[PDB]
Design a protein around this ligand. Structure first.
Ligand SMILES: Nc1nc2[nH]cc(CCCN3CC[C@@H](SC[C@H]4O[C@@H](n5cnc6c(N)ncnc65)[C@H](O)[C@@H]4O)C[C@@H]3C(=O)O)c2c(=O)[nH]1
Length: 158
């Protein structure tokens, strides 16, 4: 099954954290990366003191069940998501979100697929459109149609 995973990091210098997470995704059992979007920069919209986010999308081929894939993404967040710089580990700065999982619809306590808010997030839709422009959602909405309707601002490459 082709799962599409959004990866974001708001560390001040996030390239090494993002690469550690991508390496970790490729090492998930019974799975392997098919394609990775470019890295994109998303400035914060409200308070300008928060760092920019680095955002990307990953196509992962996997035979795992959806909740099993979520277990691994959450393990990676626990293992790689915090960075130490001086005397303490900072807060979690890495987010891994399952956007789509084949054409399955999931609505459990733990997992909502398609991701509940991806249709409002250019930082999710634009990297996904780069790697899967013909993507169709389980209910028949088209990724191109969503971007056409909202005319989201394009994001700069990192
Ligand atoms: N520029 C920019 N880039 C950005 N990147 C990412 C963000 C916000 C990340 C916030 N995001 C982090 C992961 C989860 S954490 C909560 C619970 O959600 C459950 N869950 C349900 N369905 C899920 C699914 N499909 N995948 C993964 N978890 C899923 C899970 O059980 C967990 O316990 C959702 C949360 C959110 O999006 O609400 C952001 C930004 O703000 N700005």
């Amino acid at each position: 099954t082709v799962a599409y995973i959004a990866i974001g990091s708001n560390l001040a210098s996030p390239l090494e954290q993002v690469n550690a997470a991508l390496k970790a995704l490729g090492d998930i059992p019974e799975s392997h990366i098919l394609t990775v979007s470019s890295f994109y920069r998303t400035p914060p919209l409200g308070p300008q003191d928060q760092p920019d986010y680095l955002n990307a999308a990953v196509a992962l081929e996997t035979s795992l069940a959806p909740e099993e894939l979520l277990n691994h993404t959450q393990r990676i967040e626990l293992q790689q998501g915090r960075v130490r710089k001086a005397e303490r580990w900072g807060p979690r700065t890495l987010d891994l979100d399952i956007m789509l999982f084949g054409n399955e619809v999931i609505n459990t306590e733990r997992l909502t697929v398609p991701h509940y808010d991806m249709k409002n997030r250019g930082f999710m839709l634009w990297p996904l459109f780069e790697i899967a422009p013909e993507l169709v959602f389980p209910d028949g909405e088209m990724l191109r149609q969503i971007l056409h309707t909202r005319a989201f601002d394009k994001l700069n490459k990192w």
